[PDB]
Tab-separated table of C-alpha atoms in Angstrom:
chain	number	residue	atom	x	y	z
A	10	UNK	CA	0.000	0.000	0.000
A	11	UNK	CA	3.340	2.565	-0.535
A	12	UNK	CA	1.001	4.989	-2.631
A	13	UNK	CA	-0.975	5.231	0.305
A	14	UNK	CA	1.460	5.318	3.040
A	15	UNK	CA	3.182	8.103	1.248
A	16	UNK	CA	-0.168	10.016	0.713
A	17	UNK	CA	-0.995	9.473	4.445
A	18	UNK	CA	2.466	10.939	5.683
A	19	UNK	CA	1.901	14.199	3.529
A	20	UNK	CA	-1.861	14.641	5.470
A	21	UNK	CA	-0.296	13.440	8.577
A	22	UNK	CA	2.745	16.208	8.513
A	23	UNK	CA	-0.265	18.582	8.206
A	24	UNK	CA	-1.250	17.359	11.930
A	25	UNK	CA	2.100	17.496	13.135
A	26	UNK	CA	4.637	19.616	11.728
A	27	UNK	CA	5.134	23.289	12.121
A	28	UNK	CA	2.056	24.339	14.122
A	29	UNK	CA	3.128	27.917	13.847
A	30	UNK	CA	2.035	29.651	10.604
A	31	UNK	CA	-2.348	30.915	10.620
A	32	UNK	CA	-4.659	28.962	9.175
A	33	UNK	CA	-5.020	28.858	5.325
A	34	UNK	CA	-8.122	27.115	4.018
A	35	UNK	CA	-6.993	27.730	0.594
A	36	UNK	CA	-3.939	25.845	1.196
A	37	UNK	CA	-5.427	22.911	3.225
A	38	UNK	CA	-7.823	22.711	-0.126
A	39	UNK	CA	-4.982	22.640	-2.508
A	40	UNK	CA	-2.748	19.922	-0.869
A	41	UNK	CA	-6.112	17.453	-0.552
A	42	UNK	CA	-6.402	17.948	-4.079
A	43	UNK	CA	-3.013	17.147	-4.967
A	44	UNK	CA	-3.402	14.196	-2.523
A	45	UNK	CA	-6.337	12.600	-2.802
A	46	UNK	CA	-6.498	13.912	-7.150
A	47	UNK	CA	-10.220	15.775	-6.767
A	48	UNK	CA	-11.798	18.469	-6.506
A	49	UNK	CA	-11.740	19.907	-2.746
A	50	UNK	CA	-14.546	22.038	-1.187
A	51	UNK	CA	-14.197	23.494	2.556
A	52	UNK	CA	-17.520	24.201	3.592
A	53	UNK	CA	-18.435	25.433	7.683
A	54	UNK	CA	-21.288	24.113	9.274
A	55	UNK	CA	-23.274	27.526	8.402
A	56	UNK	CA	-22.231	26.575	4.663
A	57	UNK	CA	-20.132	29.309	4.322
A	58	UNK	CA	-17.207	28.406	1.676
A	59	UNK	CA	-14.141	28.461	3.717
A	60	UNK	CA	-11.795	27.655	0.410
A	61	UNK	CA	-11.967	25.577	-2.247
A	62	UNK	CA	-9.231	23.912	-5.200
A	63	UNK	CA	-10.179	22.520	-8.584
A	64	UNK	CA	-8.160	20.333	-11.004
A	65	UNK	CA	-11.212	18.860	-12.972
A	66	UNK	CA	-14.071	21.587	-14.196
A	67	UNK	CA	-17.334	19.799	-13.818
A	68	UNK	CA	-20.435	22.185	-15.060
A	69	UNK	CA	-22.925	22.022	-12.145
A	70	UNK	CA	-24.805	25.447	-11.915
A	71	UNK	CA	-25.822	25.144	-7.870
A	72	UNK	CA	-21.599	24.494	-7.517
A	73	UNK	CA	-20.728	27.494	-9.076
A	74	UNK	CA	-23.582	29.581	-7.225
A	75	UNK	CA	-22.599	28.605	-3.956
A	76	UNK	CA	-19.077	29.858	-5.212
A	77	UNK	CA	-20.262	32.880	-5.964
A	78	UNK	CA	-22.103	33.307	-2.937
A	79	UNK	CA	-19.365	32.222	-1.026
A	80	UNK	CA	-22.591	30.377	0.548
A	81	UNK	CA	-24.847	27.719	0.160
A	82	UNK	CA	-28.463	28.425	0.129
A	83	UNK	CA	-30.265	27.714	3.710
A	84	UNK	CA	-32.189	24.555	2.713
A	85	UNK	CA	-28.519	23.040	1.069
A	86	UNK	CA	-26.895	23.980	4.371
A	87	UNK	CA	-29.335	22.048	6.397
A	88	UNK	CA	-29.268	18.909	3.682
A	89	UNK	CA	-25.524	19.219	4.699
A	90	UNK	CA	-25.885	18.848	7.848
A	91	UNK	CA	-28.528	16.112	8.178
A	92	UNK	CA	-25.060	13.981	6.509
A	93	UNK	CA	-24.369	12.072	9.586
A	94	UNK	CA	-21.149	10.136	8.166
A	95	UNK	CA	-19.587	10.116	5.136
A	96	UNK	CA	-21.909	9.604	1.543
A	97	UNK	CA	-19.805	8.350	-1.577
A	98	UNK	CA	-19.859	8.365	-5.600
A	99	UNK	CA	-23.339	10.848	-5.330
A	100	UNK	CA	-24.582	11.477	-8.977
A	101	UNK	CA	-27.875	12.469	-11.084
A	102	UNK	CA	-29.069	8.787	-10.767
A	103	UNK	CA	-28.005	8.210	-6.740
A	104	UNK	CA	-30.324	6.226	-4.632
A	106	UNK	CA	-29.545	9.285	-0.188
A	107	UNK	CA	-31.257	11.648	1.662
A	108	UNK	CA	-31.160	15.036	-0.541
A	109	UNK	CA	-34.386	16.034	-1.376
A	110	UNK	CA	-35.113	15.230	-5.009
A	111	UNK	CA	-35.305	19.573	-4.837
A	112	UNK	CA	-32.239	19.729	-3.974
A	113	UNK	CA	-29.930	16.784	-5.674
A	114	UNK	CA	-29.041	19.679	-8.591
A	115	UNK	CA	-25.667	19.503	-6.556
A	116	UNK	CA	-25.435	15.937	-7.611
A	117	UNK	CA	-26.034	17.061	-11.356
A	118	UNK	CA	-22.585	15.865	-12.669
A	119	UNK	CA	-19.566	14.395	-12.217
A	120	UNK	CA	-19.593	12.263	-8.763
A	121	UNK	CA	-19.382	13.505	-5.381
A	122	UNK	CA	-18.072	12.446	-1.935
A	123	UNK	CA	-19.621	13.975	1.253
A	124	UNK	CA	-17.173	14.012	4.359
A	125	UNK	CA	-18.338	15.358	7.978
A	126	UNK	CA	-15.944	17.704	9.399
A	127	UNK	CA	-16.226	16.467	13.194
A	128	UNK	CA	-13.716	18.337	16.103
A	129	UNK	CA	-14.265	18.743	19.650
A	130	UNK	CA	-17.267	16.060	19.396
A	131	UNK	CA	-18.624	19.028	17.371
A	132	UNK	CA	-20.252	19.294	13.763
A	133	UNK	CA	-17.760	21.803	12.432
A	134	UNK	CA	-18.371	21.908	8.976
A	135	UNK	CA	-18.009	19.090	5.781
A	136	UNK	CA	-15.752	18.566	2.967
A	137	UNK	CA	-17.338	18.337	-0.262
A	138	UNK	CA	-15.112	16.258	-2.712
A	139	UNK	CA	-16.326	16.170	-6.475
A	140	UNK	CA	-14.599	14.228	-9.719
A	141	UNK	CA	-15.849	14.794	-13.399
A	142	UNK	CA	-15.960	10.338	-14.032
A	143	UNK	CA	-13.147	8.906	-11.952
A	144	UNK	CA	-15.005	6.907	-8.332
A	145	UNK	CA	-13.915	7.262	-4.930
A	146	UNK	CA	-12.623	3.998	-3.411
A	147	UNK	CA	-11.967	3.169	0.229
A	148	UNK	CA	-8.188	4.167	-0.409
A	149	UNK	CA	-10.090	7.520	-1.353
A	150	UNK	CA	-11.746	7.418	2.010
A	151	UNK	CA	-9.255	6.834	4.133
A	152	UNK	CA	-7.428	9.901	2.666
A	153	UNK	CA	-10.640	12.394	2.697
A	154	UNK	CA	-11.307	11.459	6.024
A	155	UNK	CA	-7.618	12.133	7.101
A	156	UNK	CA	-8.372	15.828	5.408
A	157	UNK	CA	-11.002	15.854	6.977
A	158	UNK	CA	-9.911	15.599	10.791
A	159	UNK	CA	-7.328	18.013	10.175
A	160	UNK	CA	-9.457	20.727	8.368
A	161	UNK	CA	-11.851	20.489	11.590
A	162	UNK	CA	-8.288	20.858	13.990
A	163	UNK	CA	-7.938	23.711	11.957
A	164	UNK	CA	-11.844	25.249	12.383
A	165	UNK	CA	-11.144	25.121	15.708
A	166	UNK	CA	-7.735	27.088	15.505
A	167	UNK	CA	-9.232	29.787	13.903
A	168	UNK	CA	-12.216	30.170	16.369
A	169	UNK	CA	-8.965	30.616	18.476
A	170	UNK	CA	-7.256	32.738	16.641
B	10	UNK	CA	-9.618	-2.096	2.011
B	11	UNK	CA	-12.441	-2.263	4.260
B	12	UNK	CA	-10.603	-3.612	6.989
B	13	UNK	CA	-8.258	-0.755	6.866
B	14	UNK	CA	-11.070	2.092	6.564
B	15	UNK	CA	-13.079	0.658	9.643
B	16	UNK	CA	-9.469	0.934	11.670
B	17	UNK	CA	-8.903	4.108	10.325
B	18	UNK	CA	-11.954	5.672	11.799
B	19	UNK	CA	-11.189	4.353	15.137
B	20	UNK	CA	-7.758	5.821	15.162
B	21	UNK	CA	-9.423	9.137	13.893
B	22	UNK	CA	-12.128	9.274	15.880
B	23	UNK	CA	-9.884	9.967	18.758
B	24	UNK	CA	-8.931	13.496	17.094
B	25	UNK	CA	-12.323	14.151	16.043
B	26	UNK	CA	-13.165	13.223	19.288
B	27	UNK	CA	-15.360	15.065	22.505
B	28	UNK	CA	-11.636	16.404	24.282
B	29	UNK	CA	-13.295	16.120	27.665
B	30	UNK	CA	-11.904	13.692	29.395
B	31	UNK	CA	-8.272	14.059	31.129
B	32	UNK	CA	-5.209	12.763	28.974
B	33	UNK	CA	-4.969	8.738	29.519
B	34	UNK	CA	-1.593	7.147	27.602
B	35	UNK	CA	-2.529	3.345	29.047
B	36	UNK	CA	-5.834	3.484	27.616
B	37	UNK	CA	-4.640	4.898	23.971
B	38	UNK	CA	-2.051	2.366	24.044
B	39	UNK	CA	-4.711	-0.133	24.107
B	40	UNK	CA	-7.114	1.600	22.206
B	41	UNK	CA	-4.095	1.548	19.070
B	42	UNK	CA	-3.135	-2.193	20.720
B	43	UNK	CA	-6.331	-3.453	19.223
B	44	UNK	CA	-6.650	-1.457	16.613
B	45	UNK	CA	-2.736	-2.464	14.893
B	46	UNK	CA	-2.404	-5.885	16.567
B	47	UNK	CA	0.595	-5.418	18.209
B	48	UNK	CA	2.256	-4.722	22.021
B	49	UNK	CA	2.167	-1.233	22.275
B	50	UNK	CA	5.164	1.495	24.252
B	51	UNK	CA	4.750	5.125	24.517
B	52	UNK	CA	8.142	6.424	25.349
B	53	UNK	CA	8.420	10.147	25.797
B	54	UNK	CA	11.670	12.030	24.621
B	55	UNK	CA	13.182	11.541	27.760
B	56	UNK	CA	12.134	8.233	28.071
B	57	UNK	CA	10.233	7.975	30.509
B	58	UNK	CA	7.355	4.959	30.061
B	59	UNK	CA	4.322	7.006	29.617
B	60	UNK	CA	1.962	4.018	28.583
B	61	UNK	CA	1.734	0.393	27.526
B	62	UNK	CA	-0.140	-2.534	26.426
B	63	UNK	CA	0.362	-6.085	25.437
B	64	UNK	CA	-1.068	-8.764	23.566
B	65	UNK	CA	1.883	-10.861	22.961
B	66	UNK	CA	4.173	-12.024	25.002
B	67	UNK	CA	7.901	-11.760	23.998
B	68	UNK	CA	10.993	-12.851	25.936
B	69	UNK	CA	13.259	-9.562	25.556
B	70	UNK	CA	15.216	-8.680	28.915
B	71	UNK	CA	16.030	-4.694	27.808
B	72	UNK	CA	12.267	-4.528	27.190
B	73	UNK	CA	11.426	-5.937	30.660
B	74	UNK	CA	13.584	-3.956	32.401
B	75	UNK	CA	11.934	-0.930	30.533
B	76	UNK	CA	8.947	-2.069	31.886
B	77	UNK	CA	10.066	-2.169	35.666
B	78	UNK	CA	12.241	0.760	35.855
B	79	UNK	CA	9.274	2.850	34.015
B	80	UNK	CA	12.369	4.134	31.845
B	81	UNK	CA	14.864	3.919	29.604
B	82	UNK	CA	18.936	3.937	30.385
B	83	UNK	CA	20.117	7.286	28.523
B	84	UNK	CA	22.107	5.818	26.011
B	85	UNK	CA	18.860	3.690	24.261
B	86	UNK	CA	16.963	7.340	25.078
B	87	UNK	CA	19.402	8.838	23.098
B	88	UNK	CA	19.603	6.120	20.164
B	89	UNK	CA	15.754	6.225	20.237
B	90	UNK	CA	15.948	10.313	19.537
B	91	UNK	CA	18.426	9.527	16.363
B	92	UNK	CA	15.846	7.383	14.843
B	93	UNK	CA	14.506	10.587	12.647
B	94	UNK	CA	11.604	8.483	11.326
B	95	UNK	CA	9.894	5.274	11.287
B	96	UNK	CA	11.847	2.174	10.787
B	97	UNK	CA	10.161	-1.592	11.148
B	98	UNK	CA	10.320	-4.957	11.446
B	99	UNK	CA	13.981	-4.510	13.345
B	100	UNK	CA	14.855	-8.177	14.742
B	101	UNK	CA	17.999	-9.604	15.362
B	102	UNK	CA	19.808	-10.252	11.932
B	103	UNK	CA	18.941	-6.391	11.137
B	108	UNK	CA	21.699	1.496	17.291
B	109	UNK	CA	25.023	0.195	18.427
B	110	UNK	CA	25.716	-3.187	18.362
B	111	UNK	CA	25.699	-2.950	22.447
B	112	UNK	CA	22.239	-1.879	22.540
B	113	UNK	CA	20.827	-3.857	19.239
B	114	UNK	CA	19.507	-6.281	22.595
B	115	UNK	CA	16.598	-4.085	22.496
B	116	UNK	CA	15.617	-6.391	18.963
B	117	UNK	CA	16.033	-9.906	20.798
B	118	UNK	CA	13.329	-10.998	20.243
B	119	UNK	CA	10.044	-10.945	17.673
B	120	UNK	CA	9.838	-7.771	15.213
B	121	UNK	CA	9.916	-4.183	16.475
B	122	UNK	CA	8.630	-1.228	14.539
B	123	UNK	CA	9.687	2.776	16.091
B	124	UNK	CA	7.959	4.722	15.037
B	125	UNK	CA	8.692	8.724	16.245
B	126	UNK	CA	6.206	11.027	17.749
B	127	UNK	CA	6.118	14.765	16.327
B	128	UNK	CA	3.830	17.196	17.635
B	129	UNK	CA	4.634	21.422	16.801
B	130	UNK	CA	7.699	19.914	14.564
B	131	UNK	CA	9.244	18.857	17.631
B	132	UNK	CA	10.118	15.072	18.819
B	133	UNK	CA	7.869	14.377	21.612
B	134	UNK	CA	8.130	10.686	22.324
B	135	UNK	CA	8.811	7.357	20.604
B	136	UNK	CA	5.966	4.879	19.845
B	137	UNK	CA	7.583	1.280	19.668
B	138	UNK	CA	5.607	-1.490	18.431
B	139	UNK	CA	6.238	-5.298	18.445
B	140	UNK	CA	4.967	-8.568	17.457
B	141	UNK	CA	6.601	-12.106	17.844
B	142	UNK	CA	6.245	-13.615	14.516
B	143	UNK	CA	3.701	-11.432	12.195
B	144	UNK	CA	5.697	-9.025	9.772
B	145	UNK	CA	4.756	-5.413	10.154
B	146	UNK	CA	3.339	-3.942	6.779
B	147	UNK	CA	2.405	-0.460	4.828
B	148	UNK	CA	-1.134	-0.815	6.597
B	149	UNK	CA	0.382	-1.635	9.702
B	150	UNK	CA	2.461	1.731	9.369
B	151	UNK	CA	-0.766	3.738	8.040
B	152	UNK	CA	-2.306	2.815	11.684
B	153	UNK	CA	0.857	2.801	13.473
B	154	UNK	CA	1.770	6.511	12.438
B	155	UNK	CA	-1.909	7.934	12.164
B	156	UNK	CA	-1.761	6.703	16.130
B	157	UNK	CA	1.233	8.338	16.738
B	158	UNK	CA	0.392	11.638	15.971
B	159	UNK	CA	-2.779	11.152	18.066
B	160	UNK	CA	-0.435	10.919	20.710
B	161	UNK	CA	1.772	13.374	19.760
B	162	UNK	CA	-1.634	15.489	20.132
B	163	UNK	CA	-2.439	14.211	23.439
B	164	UNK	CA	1.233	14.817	24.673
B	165	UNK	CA	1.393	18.615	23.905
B	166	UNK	CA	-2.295	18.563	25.709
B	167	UNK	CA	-1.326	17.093	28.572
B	168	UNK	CA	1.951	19.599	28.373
B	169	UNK	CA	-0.927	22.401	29.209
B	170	UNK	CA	-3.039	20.712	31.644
């Protein structure tokens, strides 16, 4: 498993190296897309875009709304957080608990839903979308690494 | 790799986790005992035994006395702190020569603890027969920065 391992170790230095330099969702987004090869969405538990990274454009108008809001919609936010663990491969013909409403941000590519969990606390999730490509357990293990250390992070900048 | 993913989320759950109770090395050691399949030795930087667990007995001397003087001699402290990252499955056909009696026995994997990008502690890990592998060091070094964690936490307590 030496892809993995090595994958793993670049997260993991993320937990345990440094600890001095602000937080940087931006930069937390870029290195899980790198990683884990997706695209990475940092969303808090208000669903208020805390960064983002693309490597694959997939055209999915509620996506590039919620950019440009810098926000999901109230309703989407909720939908969020009613995700009690993380949802895999989510497309057009997925089978869930989205209101049929609101599975537009399911309209392409496929989509991985990760809880961001610190403190015993809901802090936020990690949206992880790829244009055909699925996510595997390998995947998994990876964007729920991310995951863990976006929330560390959450809670370093309520800190801050 | 199911098997993998499940132990993943036990390991991670401890980061993700509450942060209520009081720091508690014995219990994580057996909490990442289970979870790796393996004896388990938290060893801080000076160290000083700061937690174990075992589910395999192995005949080693230099361990046992480890064990019972809660400590190691400063020379294997100080070989310990030169091991810059994880090496495994150390036995002995594989430290000076002297102190190689730390690998008597079985297979031993150290694996360092880094917390603030500073050497904490030293998890050690060993089996008597089974070969540690890449999953094995996945689990193995996802627990040891939970520790790592834990240490600096119980630093401000």
């Amino acid at each position: 498993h030496m892809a993995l391992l090595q994958k793993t170790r670049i997260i993991n230095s993320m937990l345990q190296a440094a600890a001095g330099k602000p937080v940087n969702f931006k930069e937390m987004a870029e290195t899980l897309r790198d990683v884990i090869d997706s695209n990475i969405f940092v969303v808090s538990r208000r669903g208020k875009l805390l960064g983002y990274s693309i490597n694959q454009q997939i055209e999915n108008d509620r996506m590039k709304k919620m950019l440009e809001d810098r926000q999901f919609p109230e309703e989407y936010t909720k939908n969020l957080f009613n995700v009690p663990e993380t949802s895999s491969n989510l497309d057009i013909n997925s089978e869930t608990a989205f209101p049929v409403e609101n599975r537009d941000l399911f309209q392409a590519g496929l989509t991985t839903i990760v809880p961001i969990i610190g403190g015993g606390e809901r802090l936020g999730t990690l949206i992880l979308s790829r244009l055909q490509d699925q996510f595997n357990d390998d995947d998994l293990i990876l964007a729920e690494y991310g995951a863990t250390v976006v929330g560390m992070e959450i809670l370093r900048e309520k800190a801050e």
